[PDB]
Curated annotation (Swiss-Prot), chains A, B:
Residues the record marks as active site: 227 (for dhoase activity)
Positions annotated to bind (S)-dihydroorotate: 16, 46, 202, 231, 243
Annotated binding of Zn(2+) 2, by residue: 12, 154, 178
Disulfide-linked positions: none
Effect annotated for changing residue 178 to T: Abolishes dihydroorotase activity
Name this polypeptide is given: Multifunctional protein CAD
Subunit annotation: Homohexamer. Interacts with CIPC.
Modified residues (N6-carboxylysine): 97
Induction, as annotated: Transcriptionally repressed following hypoxia by HIF1A.
Processing after translation: Activated by MAP kinase (Erk1/2) phosphorylation just prior to the S phase of the cell cycle, when the demand for pyrimidine nucleotides is greatest, and down-regulated as the cells emerge from S phase by protein kinase A (PKA) phosphorylation.
Amino acid sequence: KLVRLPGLIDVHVHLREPGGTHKEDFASGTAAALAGGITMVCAMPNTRPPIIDAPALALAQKLAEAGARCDFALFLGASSENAGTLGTVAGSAAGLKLYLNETFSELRLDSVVQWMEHFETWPSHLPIVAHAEQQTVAAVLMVAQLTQRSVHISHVARKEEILLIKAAKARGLPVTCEVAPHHLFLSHDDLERLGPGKGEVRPELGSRQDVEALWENMAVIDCFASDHAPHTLEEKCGSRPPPGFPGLETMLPLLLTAVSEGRLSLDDLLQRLHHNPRRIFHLPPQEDTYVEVDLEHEWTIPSHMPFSKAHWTPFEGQKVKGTVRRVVLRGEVAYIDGQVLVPPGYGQDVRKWPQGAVPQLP
Amino acid sequence: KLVRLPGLIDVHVHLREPGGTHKEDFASGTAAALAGGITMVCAMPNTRPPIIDAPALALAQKLAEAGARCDFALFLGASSENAGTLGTVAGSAAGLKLYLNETFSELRLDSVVQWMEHFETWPSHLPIVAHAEQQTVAAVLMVAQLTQRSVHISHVARKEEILLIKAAKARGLPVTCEVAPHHLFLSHDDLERLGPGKGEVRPELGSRQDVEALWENMAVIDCFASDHAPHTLEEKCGSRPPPGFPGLETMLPLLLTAVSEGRLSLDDLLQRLHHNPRRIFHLPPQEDTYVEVDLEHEWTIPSHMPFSKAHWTPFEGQKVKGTVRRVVLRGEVAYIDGQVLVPPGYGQDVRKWPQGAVPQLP
Ligand SMILES: [Zn+2]
Ligand SMILES: [Zn+2]
Ligand SMILES: [Zn+2]
Ligand SMILES: [Zn+2]
């Protein structure tokens, strides 16, 4: 007996196109999404070139429309040069992303004053997301208060961070956050097995106490999102390992295992992979769209999942219970038992749908 | 014709006793203070042992009462172990100091949650000061708002920081700040001359644009304070140079030069070295206490000033106009033209004066 879920949404994926297509592209990344029960993704802007102006966004939109197999929205990225310049294209994007810790030259912000300028200039009704670790979470929360608006904090990984967000919410501040599966299901205890190269991710893997704190504070977590950050094994095992893990194909199976063990409910899961992503990012419903999962099937995560070009996974060897059996996207069968059945280009930009525009005052 | 000033206050000095007395002690540091026209100092807690509990404070109080030549108050320091333990001695201290960036093991805080615990437990009517650089200023401001109280930011050094504080003040937040003379009178342009060892200080020397921003934003600066941080030349020129500059003997001459050039007024100076320190830290007046200065005398800063055991200065070679001629402290001549005339032990703990206790609700 299969369980029918709505079409799940991952608001944080790196699909590497343009410019890193050996790591992943729209076609491979969205195949990975569908196999993981995800029917809509929001793609991050740290591509090459990065999506930091209108021409780069226009290119990315066409690459996505031609390559995506599931539906999508594309983030714009904040730079040291583009505050006050994105107003005409802002509404066509998923939102604006600020990289406040380690980043590529083009997305580096060298001053909190630049963060303020973005919060002041980006349209007030549109989403802003920050990669912010440790005290940077407190800092960007301050900037959000000074500019009187909301902020979404990406991949919370530490007890310190989730307790700070909890305290902010207790004071009624408009902050939401997400947590990635590797910060719920891996810790320092796994670095031995992974090694210093594969184990490289940002935010870094937490202690057992960090992991326990995130579970204890599940009520504070608004969304789950993969931070799918594909890099090849050659890159991860090399001399200058880039941070990041692939995660689209493993996220839902890991979380379904946790549901089966009673660590959270099916509803808790659907709030965090469907309802809260919709409401925070103003993402539209998808008609005739659903995912069928088998909660009984026990399997072991292999050395690589079938679709991501990353061709490795940090969850290798973990036992899971829960499998995606079928995905239907807008009335077409998109995935069955290991086979993707919609072509590159089937996916659409949800921000171009009438129901996908963010409502605003005239 | 000499100008009579009130007794000036430096709220940020490191006098190194106990535990670093080769660098400075209470007797030498307060001689330096008097020679710089300073009649009251607030001593920082990063001594050895650091002033992080009642026994250490008790020892420091006796060392100061025996050695100080001018009046003083002593800070307590926040640690990872002492939140909630300082209530009985808190009122006897200048305030509580948090070291939020680089620090010794004992004063290191590893989580913003620890900062919050201190803001929640330290008595609400007593001062809290933070060493906070760059985004750390935004972070500690957030903690101050979450806990609904004030904070004083030490040595603001950058355009980024002063503009952040300016924006916070425009929103009516209870934040004050101070700037040190090296961040007004030295910059990157001086690193050539100083070298990488002598030039080591935290916050680091700013760009010319940072320096210009602090002057342009003088209205935002509540206090001047030296951050007198004596280290010997051997230490500064050695393989692991500690950060910090000596500054008590040079601060007032540098600032008087700026007054003579019309860069700020005499009143602007007295607000920042007398009135605002009194009101922010609830420091009492000193009876029959005053400083006589000569604003006409031009001289060149030598390779070392007479009193600090640091026996070097980063201002060597700068031309100044303005000299301290006489200091009277509580009715006794304390300093005349290069000679200190009150003995170690003349100085008193102002927090023990009836007028030096901080008023509170019963
Ligand atoms: Zn990130
Ligand atoms: Zn990311
Ligand atoms: Zn400091
Ligand atoms: Zn200091």
